[PDB]
Symmetry: D4
Subunit: 240 residues, 8 copies
């Protein structure tokens, strides 16, 4: 994949914990690599991108440079749909450490990914809860690529989406949605190829090959997708 980079754009701002830092401000250096296929253009603007970055960077005084570096990434993805993966290093060479060094930097790195989430409900307006969820999901900026039809004391459905949130972060934002509708049932099923085993998340979801109703609605929107572990197209798993 091709990349566009901006190396070491200088920025003055007022970020830092100390209220003296917020008062004097200091120099910050930004560097980013944006990845996407250039083959079509060969066969984004710099001035603009730098201008926006430089606007976004000074709208406020954050306490943490992490928080600013992340805002830039998030807003870059919102404004340049072309971009697939971004890596932004934010450097703070005047940090008040009192030692000699070249610099301290925080670098945040995010990649658009395709995922499938299962929704279920069985109390209240069973289907109202399903729609509210795809909505809350859309509101968080995650894109809804493709949704299945919904199946009839429970209602189910699955959704294909696109997000730059790492798996664990997606999961957290899924649980936050469960909360803010009073605890529905959202499950991350796959996020691409990926396969994890952490305390809070197993990918792919450990029961997919044994839940007919999940394979059902999964096979409707993604009959050819391969299960990264069983090495089989959904279409086929559904056949047993």
């Amino acid at each position: 994949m091709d990349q566009l980079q901006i190396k070491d754009l200088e920025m003055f701002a007022y970020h830092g914990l100390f209220p003296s830092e917020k008062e004097l401000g200091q120099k910050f250096i930004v560097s980013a690599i944006l990845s996407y296929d250039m083959t079509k253009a060969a066969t984004v603007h710099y001035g603009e991108l730098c201008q926006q970055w430089t606007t976004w960077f000074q709208e406020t005084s954050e306490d943490l440079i992490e928080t600013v570096a992340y805002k830039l990434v998030e807003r870059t993805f919102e404004s340049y749909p072309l971009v697939q993966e971004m890596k932004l290093e934010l450097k703070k060479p005047w940090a008040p450490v009192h030692l000699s060094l070249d610099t301290c930097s925080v670098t945040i790195h995010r990649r658009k990914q395709r995922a499938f989430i299962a929704l279920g409900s069985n109390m209240g307006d069973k289907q109202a809860n399903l729609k509210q969820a795809i909505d809350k999901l859309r509101a968080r900026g995650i894109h809804i690529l493709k949704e299945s039809s919904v199946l009839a004391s429970f209602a189910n459905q699955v959704v294909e989406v696109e997000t730059w949130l790492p798996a664990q972060d997606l999961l957290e934002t899924l649980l936050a949605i469960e909360s803010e509708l009073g605890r529905i049932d959202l499950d991350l099923l796959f996020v691409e190829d990926q396969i994890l085993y952490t305390d809070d998340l197993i990918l792919p979801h450990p029961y997919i090959a044994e839940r007919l109703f999940v394979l059902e609605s999964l096979q409707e929107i993604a009959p050819h997708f391969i299960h990264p572990i069983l090495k089989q197209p959904i279409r086929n798993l559904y056949d047993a």
Copy 2:
């Protein structure tokens, strides 16, 4: 794998979108990494710097493009053409006088391509079937993609079927796009081209699924696949064509 690199070669030219730019020109800096096994050259066959730099600096100045991407890609595209030894290339084109009006170091575009072996299936069932296939494999050649090995074309209103093994540096999505472009420019059934495998790779995108999802189910595709590549391993089923064919 081993690498030759040219770091920060300086070049003046006149690319840019603004007409003021095409008028004054500006400094550009080029860097590249070319990869290929040097074991043979080192032990007895290799690229020359003076020439490589000299050529790049010619191709770079031939014209003014609007976008530096387009110039970076051209240099990559032709380097591959002129130095078949090279397997993988990564070329960064830096534009440090870009008219941003802020302090930075530089703003660059870097294009990265690698040769890959791929298998594409051809089918025709109207007209001079067998010539439609030939003209497709020609368009392929003409777009710089290399025909490594080609099966024989069998009759399967019958289909002429064949599969071709090729070497190309176009990324998967791009190979596909050029495949469709070729279907178009021979009347869109006239020919069918399918991307079956590009090496080991496995993609699931809106436009391309690799490997192609019906390979293990299409005797006529395993037919021709098995003739030229019986030991190639299906990256999903984790079996040799040869074996998949025996059902």
Copy 3:
């Protein structure tokens, strides 16, 4: 995953093999990359530079070591101890006044460690079986490796058997070596420790095979494995413990 880095922090100290070095000391330069997900800190939890640098510069000067490796490793080892947030660390220690007598830039040693989840099996059939196991899991804790989850110990002259799930940054070969060192220092049957899995990893070296080659065949190991990690996937058999257990 996101990263904090400290680039080129300068430090004077007295490490070196030569006694002339311990006497004059020299300049050293430290650089590191610490990795961990910053999404939570950025959105509501994070490391501080001033402190991190200040600590490193204390631990660096506590003593004179012979070898810079040993100082680099100490900084890594303690950074993990003091900042559990950190998942992966890569620390470069540059020694640009090294007494080589040739012109260069610098000569550095860089040590790189990542936390990993691993499963280790314990067995005992002599003495206070159940205490031998406890003391092993203690030695483990005492060497800084973390006990994440531990199965129950079952009787299988019977064996006490158990398996433990742990988090450690020691590379596979090193985990093993410390496993054997623990067998030694409790009388070498007193206890058996086996490395079963370290994540996804699969090695075949003279001293260690991962995953351990008999896991799918030892009901008593799947027993305890299935109790704490039934969904973990065997990286070879490409199945969940749970399933391997059902035979």
Copy 4:
């Protein structure tokens, strides 16, 4: 894995095609990353390594900087068995290009790898040819780790070895050995985990799971090794 690096050691020598270059000599800059586990030392010498490199580099005038960069790598592995993987960049900033640039470099990169090779013979002193082969192999600097016993109108055997030669280069050196004994039959079976499909080499060797005599002698020295494709221990493949 940990690394030791030397950045930009300067060297004057007489390498180049032009006989003017051989005459005046010029400056060369060397940089290397040597990888091996440091955990044992923490719980190689620089002065020496630089001195040797700098000796080896000036013993001769090669035409190609590639050839010198490779000599250094090869000799480094011979002299420091500890080293597992090496990456040496040789830079030629005075190259006679007549343009402005920072430098042109060649960088050669090699890693020790475990491989298994099958030997067969069936004409002449069947077993004499087998022994001559393991010898020729040892003479090329490849290490013999472990050899099986030899099986009885053919004689077979398999060998486990260690080499930093990339797969294709191993293969070439195998065919060179076949030649210099008058055309035996050496086959690369595995080189570690690796799996290739090139015109001259398929790894693993496409017939292993179907050759009882190969599995035989393979199961003797490596019953637990996993077939990177069939995902099975040799021991088990041999059982059918």
Copy 5:
């Protein structure tokens, strides 16, 4: 003497001859050495006796972007002229203006213009014998002031010519001072009569200008009014006080 310096201030602007340059603009870099005696500021903690960078940099950067000049010399000269006007502490300048994106089409590090000026004490003889002799004189010292050269001390007038000599402070080098003298003469009907006498210590012998003016020690009415305002000033060639020269 002490020096305050600003190294490599970055500034984007639109200066140059080509109209494509005035359209895209380009990066310029500034570096200056301001000189003056910092001993009072260091010692009395005297904020008024030092220059504030932040503001220096901020002004320079404003004056720098007010307009698009054709030549960078013109812009560099402007900052020098303005600094002297706004920061009377400063005694001597040297300001370098770098143009690294200059459309040369070769590799280099940079091109740069660097203008260097120093405040100087000078003496100027004024005569008139035509129209309102009297008036001409005043209007000349005024024209002088108008140009920003400073009048330090003026002698009484000797009233068939009328005569005066003035002591002034200027940063313009001697040749330019002379030119702006002649400029005034002209913008006055060619009446007045201006002569550079000394500019400090200096002694030149060029086509347009001889310093000290070669007739001083023989012109009684010049000593007359020179001894009035600088009796102790020493003739750089004859090596004596005006005072004594006048006594002959």
Copy 6:
């Protein structure tokens, strides 16, 4: 003359005008050129870096000054005090993190001082004239300026003194006037005149060198030929000895 130089020594401290700067501190870079004749050290005596850099760094961090000048001056002043070998010094203090909010390499202040030999005439005709004179040479010595040579003392009491100072002329002068003040200033008490400061020759509003009347005041030539009969008047291009025979 030879030079010893320390290039870009880094130092953290808390100097600055902004209270946020005292609070946070920033990086400062120091570079100095000390001049002195090294021929003597090189041939058998010299400065250490270990020490010079250690002290500078101590001195630089003892306090927090509002102006970096006052600090850069502190180091020049102190250095001359503790290293009498040094004859001329140039010390540049750089403030790369100055809160200007523009891109630049840096801002710096560089203070440059040189030891010089001067002659000061003292006069008194009021109170205890003799005392007056003595207290002036003392005040002077107190300010750190060195007394090299003093003439005998010559109604009015006169004297002239040979001294060594690194203060530039104008500043030497100011300090002369300040002494006159702190001693109370028709009849006077004291009169300090700068007579010469080396070779130099001025013409400014506040001071003229050499002082315009020397060649014409016998009392001055008197006590001045006594301690420096061979010194050459930078303008009349003659020895004092000689100007005195007239």
Copy 7:
């Protein structure tokens, strides 16, 4: 005086002592400081970089010299010829790839020249004396040195000339002697003397400035007061005009 400077312009060429160097060529870096008064350009006249750099680079590559000096000198010489605005020039030629086999940043040669005003006395008392004189001023003009002012011509025939040259004194002299040669050198033909070159004042084995006898040769003061009666003798500290009334 203001300065225009071109910093580290890169140029490839084939200069050098080693035949392997002519054959292969190497990189050269050039930096120049041209001085001239910019006040006039800045206020309404100046040099281009486009051009200055293009020409320098042409000139630098026309030939292959054994010494980099001869090349660095070529650029100074030519520049003064094509840009009469320039008054002083300093041009440094760096040879980073010089075949020294040691680590260093670079070796360089930097040639520095300044326009100066001089006075040359001409005499002839043999052959066609008048002609002799005229051919000398011509030879001179040929060498590029400019004739600013010539006195009228005064057995022996005498003359004195005001000229402008960038040659340092000693080299001006050498060229004077060379002319004397190429015109044939009791009775002579020509006599060139360096009388003054500005303000300057020498004392070397080959040349003394000002020439030690001026104040004592009427014929010289004669033709010299005629074209420069106000010029000041750098030593006697008087106008020629005046020295002539004696």
Copy 8:
């Protein structure tokens, strides 16, 4: 004047006071500016009139490693002294010796010592009246030569004292010249009598040395022999030729 310069030659050696430094050695960097008139070499393609770098660098680097000195000044002074001996083209030096691994234990860029010397014309008066007056004189000019100072011109001797003045070339600054004068006096039983008269143009007034020597214009036998070897040399203070001063 033109200049040849060698920038940042790297050299490893074993110089310093600590014995751990003499044991490990460390990196030193050298940079010099050699000055002389390159006009002959540029013009006549005159190889003998330029300095060869390769060799310069090679020698310096040999002399640099011959020994371990305690102080870097000593080593820097050595290269200066030796260069002048081996490359008579060179008129003026400045050689900087950098010690970046100096065991200071703070961040800096470097420490450095930089020694700067210039060939000069000087005049020295010799007198004796004791033992073999005659002999003393010769042995002194010889001692002079021995130190490497060069005898350019010596006057005839004026034979109750015997007297001579010599013209020489030295790079030692005036104070050091005086010291080595006194050194000779001593290594001769304190007989001889050496006086620095002028060293060029220069005029000093320090504790140990007044230049020009303050009695020249009144000492007939000094003018006597000075007018013999440099009649046109000009007294930097009285501004007249020795020749004329002697005529009184």
